[PDB]
Each structure stands twice: as C-alpha cells, then as structure tokens.
Amino acid sequence: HEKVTIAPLVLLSALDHYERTQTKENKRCVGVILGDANSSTIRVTNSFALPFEEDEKNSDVWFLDHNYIENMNEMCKKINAKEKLIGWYHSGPKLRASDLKINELFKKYTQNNPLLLIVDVKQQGVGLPTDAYVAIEEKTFLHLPCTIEAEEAEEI
Amino acid sequence: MFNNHEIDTILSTLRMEADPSLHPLFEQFEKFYEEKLWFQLSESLTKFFDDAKSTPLRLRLYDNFVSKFYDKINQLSVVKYLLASLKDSKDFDESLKYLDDLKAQFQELDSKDGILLIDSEIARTYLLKNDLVKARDLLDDLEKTLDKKDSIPLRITNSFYSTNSQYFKFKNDFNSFYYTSLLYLSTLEPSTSITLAERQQLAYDLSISALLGDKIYNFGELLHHPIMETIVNDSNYDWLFQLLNALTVGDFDKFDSLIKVQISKIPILAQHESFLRQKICLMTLIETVFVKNIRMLSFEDISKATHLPKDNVEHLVMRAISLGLLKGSIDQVNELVTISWVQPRIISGDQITKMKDRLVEWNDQVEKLGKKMEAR
Amino acid sequence: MVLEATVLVIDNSEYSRNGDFPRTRFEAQIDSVEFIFQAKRNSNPENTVGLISGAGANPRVLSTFTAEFGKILAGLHDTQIEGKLHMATALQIAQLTLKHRQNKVQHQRIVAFVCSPISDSRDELIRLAKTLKKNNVAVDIINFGEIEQNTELLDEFIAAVNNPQEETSHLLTVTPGPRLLYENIASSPIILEEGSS
Amino acid sequence: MATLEELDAQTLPGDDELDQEILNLSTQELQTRAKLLD
Numbered sequence: 001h002e003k004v005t006i007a008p009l010v011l012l013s014a015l016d017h018y019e020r021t022q023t024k025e026n027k028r029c030v031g032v033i034l035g036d037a038n039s040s041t042i043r044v045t046n047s048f049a050l051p052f053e054e055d056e057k058n059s060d061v062w063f064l065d066h067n068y069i070e071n072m073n074e075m076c077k078k079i080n081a082k083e084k085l086i087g088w089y090h091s092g093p094k095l096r097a098s099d100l101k102i103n104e105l106f107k108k109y110t111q112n113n114p115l116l117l118i119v120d121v122k123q124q125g126v127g128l129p130t131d132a133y134v135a136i137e138e139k140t141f142l143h144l145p146c147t148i149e150a151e152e153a154e155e156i
Numbered sequence: 157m158f159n160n161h162e163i164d165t166i167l168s169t170l171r172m173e174a175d176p177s178l179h180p181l182f183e184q185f186e187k188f189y190e191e192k193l194w195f196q197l198s199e200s201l202t203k204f205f206d207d208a209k210s211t212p213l214r215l216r217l218y219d220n221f222v223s224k225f226y227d228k229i230n231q232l233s234v235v236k237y238l239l240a241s242l243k244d245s246k247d248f249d250e251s252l253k254y255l256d257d258l259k260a261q262f263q264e265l266d267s268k269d270g271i272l273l274i275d276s277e278i279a280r281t282y283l284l285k286n287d288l289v290k291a292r293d294l295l296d297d298l299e300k301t302l303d304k305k306d307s308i309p310l311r312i313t314n315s316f317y318s319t320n321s322q323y324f325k326f327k328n329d330f331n332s333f334y335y336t337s338l339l340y341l342s343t344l345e346p347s348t349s350i351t352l353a354e355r356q357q358l359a360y361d362l363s364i365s366a367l368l369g370d371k372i373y374n375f376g377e378l379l380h381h382p383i384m385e386t387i388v389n390d391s392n393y394d395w396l397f398q399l400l401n402a403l404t405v406g407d408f409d410k411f412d413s414l415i416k417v418q419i420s421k422i423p424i425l426a427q428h429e430s431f432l433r434q435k436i437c438l439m440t441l442i443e444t445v446f447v448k449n450i451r452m453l454s455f456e457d458i459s460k461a462t463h464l465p466k467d468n469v470e471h472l473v474m475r476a477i478s479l480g481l482l483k484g485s486i487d488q489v490n491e492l493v494t495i496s497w498v499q500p501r502i503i504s505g506d507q508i509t510k511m512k513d514r515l516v517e518w519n520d521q522v523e524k525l526g527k528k529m530e531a532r
Numbered sequence: 533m534v535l536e537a538t539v540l541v542i543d544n545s546e547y548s549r550n551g552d553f554p555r556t557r558f559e560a561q562i563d564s565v566e567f568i569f570q571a572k573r574n575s576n577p578e579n580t581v582g583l584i585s586g587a588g589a590n591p592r593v594l595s596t597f598t599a600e601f602g603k604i605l606a607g608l609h610d611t612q613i614e615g616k617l618h619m620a621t622a623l624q625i626a627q628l629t630l631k632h633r634q635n636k637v638q639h640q641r642i643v644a645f646v647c648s649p650i651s652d653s654r655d656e657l658i659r660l661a662k663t664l665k666k667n668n669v670a671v672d673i674i675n676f677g678e679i680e681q682n683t684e685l686l687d688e689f690i691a692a693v694n695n696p697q698e699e700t701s702h703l704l705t706v707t708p709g710p711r712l713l714y715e716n717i718a719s720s721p722i723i724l725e726e727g728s729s
Numbered sequence: 730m731a732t733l734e735e736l737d738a739q740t741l742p743g744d745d746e747l748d749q750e751i752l753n754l755s756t757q758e759l760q761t762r763a764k765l766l767d
Contacts, residue, residue: 554732554735554736554739555736555739559739562739562743563739563742563743566742601746601749601750601753602750602753604742604746604749604750605746605749605750605753608743608746608747608750
C-alpha cells in the first residue's frame, strides 16, 4: 500500500527518547513520527517524543497530551512544511490494544489513518528493531514493510 | 406487559423528562392495542429492547418526540426499529409508505447517520423485490454510497450485504450471494443480534446458496462458523450437512438418494458432484499424494483415482480452468497431465510434518558446507 | 480560591443520551461546566481542569490540561451520547492525568458526571478512592442517575476518598426536575463556598 | 416563552466558542503569517 520510508535519525533519537525517558519494559516511549504520508510509499522525515504516561496495570489507563504536537507541528511547520504528520511511534517492542485508542488520537491529527511505529529498544533480533502499523478491521491493523532512505547525509 | 407502559411512563420521566413517551393519548394506545405482552415497540431503552412485533402503531407515537429527536432520544435511534421492526410489517407499501414518510428525510439524522437510513430506505426498497434494474442501479449507487465511506457500523454493510445479498437472494450468483451473505455473515460476525428463523433459514439459504454457489469448491467452509447447529441439524440441513459430506464423500447416491425437488430443482449438482468428486479427490491428491513437489497426477488411473472415469477424465479432468481451476496441460499419449496450481485450501495437519524436514535438511547439510566457508 | 488542577469526567451515556434537563443531559452537563470552570478559573486563574471520555465504549481524555477556554473549545464536539461508563478506568487516568498536572502545588481535583448506571466494584472504587486519597486528589462528582447513582459506590466513594473533604472528596448527586445542574451545583461545595484543599 | 432565551443563551457560549476558539486559531498563523513573511 503506502509502505514507508524509515528515518534512522528518528530511530536513533527514538531510543534516546527511550533512553532519555529511561523507559523500561514496563513502558514504551512514545512519540510523533514525521514525513509526508501521501504516496504508496510514505516517508519518515522525523519523529518526536510525546511526553506520555503508560499504565498496563489498567490497559486503557495511560496519559498523553496532543498539545505538544500542536505547538510542535507549528515549529515543525515553521521548521518545515514537509513535516506533515505521517503517524507516530512508541517504544514497543510490541503492541498493546490501548495502542488502538492511541492510534485513533492521531487519526484526528493525520491525513490517512496515521502510522504506528514499534521500535525494539533493545534492537534485539534482526532487520529492523521496528514495526510500523496502521489500524484496520474484527479490527485490522497491519505492518507494511519499511526501510531507510538517503539520507546519504545520514549515510556519511 | 406494561414494560412499554412502564417506560411509556418511566422513560417518559427517564431523564427524558415526562416525554411524548408519556402522553394521555400515548399510554392508552398500547393499552388500547394490548397490555397483553405483544406491542408497538415501547419508546427508547425498552423499545431499544422492544422490536415489538405487533406492528407498532406507536408508529405514530414513536414518531412523537421525533420532532424533539434533536433534543429527545437521539441516535440512529430510528431504523433501530420501525424502519427495521416495521420494515418487518411486511407489505410492499408499509416501509415504502414510511419511506414515503421518511424517505430518509427527516430533520437532522437523515435530511440534515441517516446514511444507514439511506442504506435502509434504499436497501429496504430492495428487500421488497423491487425490479432488478432499478435496484442494482441505485444499489450500485447504494454500493457507491457504501464505497467511500468510513462507517463504524458494519450495520451499513450489515444492511448492505444483507441487502445486496437479498439482491442476489433475488438472484442466482450465490457464488457472489452465498459468499455475499458469507461476507454478510462475517459482516454480521461481530454484531447484530438476530432470530433463529432469521439465522438458520438465511444460513440455510446461505448453505443453500453454497450449493447454488458450487462454486469454486468448497469442500470445507464457514460450516466451521456457527452456521451449523443453528442450521444442521435437519431437514435439508441433513442434506446440507451430508452435502458437506458430499463435499467430501462425493457419492452420488449418498445424495442422489437424498435428492428431492429443491436440490434436483438444480440437477447440475449431479454434475457439480462429478465436479466435486473430481475436485474433491483432486485437492488432496494436489494437497498430498505427491508431496515431493506435487504436480503430475497424470492422467488416467491417477485421474480415475478420482473414481470418476477416464472418459470423464477426458473432460472433467480435461477441463482445467474449463473446470475453473486446473493449471498445466496434457500429454495425452503418455497419458500425462501437466498441472500447476490454483488449488488452495483451508485445511491443516500434514505438510506441517513434511515442512521443516527438507527445511532442516539443506539446513543441516548447509552446516557441513556452512562450516568453514566464511569460517575458514 | 482554588489553586489546583481538576478533571472533568463526562459520561455521555445512558443518561446524557437522555436529556436530564434542557436541552439534553449531555448538553445540560455542558454549560454547567463552563459555569463550573468559569468559577473554577475564577476561583483562581490557572486553576486547571481536564476533560475525558468516561462515555461511549472508548475511554480517553477530551480536553487535556490547560486553564482554559480551550476546554470550552475542546468540549465543542459531542461524544457518544448513548455511551457507557469508563469511570474506573477513566477516573484512573484522571489520576494519572492529575499526576502530570502542570505546575503542581495545584492539587488534584476531579469533577465527574454520572450519565451511566455506574458499573464498578467497591474495592476498585475504593482503591481508586484510596489511590485518589493516596495521590491526594480532590473529587467532587456530578450524579444524576437512575434512582440516582447512589446508595452505591459514589456515596461510599466520596467518603472512601475522603479524609479531609475538598482535599479528598465532596459530592453532589444531581437532582431531577427543574434542576439546572449549574444551578444545582452552585450550592454544593463542588463549587463556590470553600473551593479547594 | 422564556426557554429559547435560556436555550439560545446557552448556545451563545457554545456560540461564543467558535469565534473565541478561532480568535485562538487566528493569532496562530497570524504570526506565522507575519513571522515568515516579515
């Protein structure tokens, strides 16, 4: 479908977020992901830690504000128009159904059904420490495969 | 039951503040109709219970507070019943006439949400046996309606499929229809409490439409899904189930014995069973017998291993996608099919085993090589 | 008066579907809140509130932390009107919410509509009430229930939250009839009178 | 006869919202309008 670019720049800071947040397996450091989502290939330009709270002692119980993104995008826009919201990330490595709820928040904030992002904060196994999901339906959500771009600037 | 009258008092005062769901005219008319447990569909949370199938003549009195339906009981709220429950008033008319009331026109829900009423009103025309042409046209527009929408209700599709099923239920194409209702079952699958006479008979008609599918076989199916017991059981469900057996057995007279009119009404299952017996035998042959890169199956005894004979092999086997399915070709001389795929299945249990074997095999024998190559 | 964060817990639900007084309970809830918040923000400017969904089948914040008319802005759009209780969860988040309340020394407050039959367990309710009291949350509840929702958790709960009142909990169980909520609550030390602790 | 009075007096704040809400919306770009352009 729209299967997506990946910004290492993201990936890196993403774990910094996880790092910075000192997120642990109890937690998933969550945040915006940025790019432009139109094409049957979506790009990840960037992404932003959403200062957040997660509780799975009660699944649906967790805390976040959008209004980061609010002020964020402004600057993001002011930084770049091409930020346009593609979706968002979290740590992961795995989903928790409250994601779905969380997913839908961004639906307000995104053009398409926005983009989830899993990360393996321990990067453990293999290609990607990462999954990106879009909701669906009998719900659906799905991983379209994704990968890096150039970003040779990165690559250098 | 006063459960209406109760609510025809209580929910009138239930928030819903002394409403048209309590009016001097109002409570009477039920009591007028009955207190006798069969009623007119009782105004909100209990009409939200009540389908009540004594044809609602609070037809009108549900239609009260529909003025206030803005600030009065508000949801879909309407084709929740009536346009549903009185859609079951079962005239031409009726709904057509309260089409002719609503016509999906009313203040906000429809003519200022009512798309599911747009569903209904249009769909509901369709369940009236409306002309095919007229149906499909706007049905496909109803479809077209359905298209670009993100509709949290299945109910829309659950209308529409059931609708478009009904459409094909007016028709053959149970290949579509059955599947459509199969779709619609999966469309109903999360939602939509129903009745059994609804359930089996449809799922019957479904299971019927399976045979009025018949198909890309099938073989096995939604039978697993709770259409069964429920449908089969008995009557043709016996057959219908035994047809699942025929979907496996493929014995003419384990069925052509069974046959009464309705099935023999379409005799082509005798063909379809020949199609079955072939295909039925085929799938496993395709699934199993060769495992060792299954293809050949070539021809005759192998094909007559379908216990359908060589000169039919000369056709049923010979027909390939002239079966709709088989790939490959024929060496007639050597009596050899060339085959390829378009044989899927839902089963399990088998190549599970065979799987990792080779998949471990190279894998093992890798390490032999896979020993020093980059290592050394 | 108040220096605290607050939460607006709205059930748009079996009752708010069903207008408790004009125009509907859900709508009736509304301007009372602006009434509430006005006073709350009049109590002090910077008195902050949340707004969440205890309504529908999906719990979530509606208006996040702010002052702020943005709430009135945020409350701008609807809800599932016939929806259902998230309270235990929704409340639980309101805790987490308030835990994050920006510029604390703002105490944790909660204002809660009951448009739902209120399905929960006393234990959880109290653990909440505890957790509230543990978190030291202010909780004053808006309940116009069937019966009302009372002789129940809510009544226990306010108590179960409460060692000191507005430092923990107060209640007003909203009344039927010509009861304008904002008129109703104007009395209760859900608002006015003494405003926070 | 005084209901729509209150009722539409109750709309007014909900009415007041939008513009007020927009008066929030206004400044937002008005800057980025100016800011960039400036």
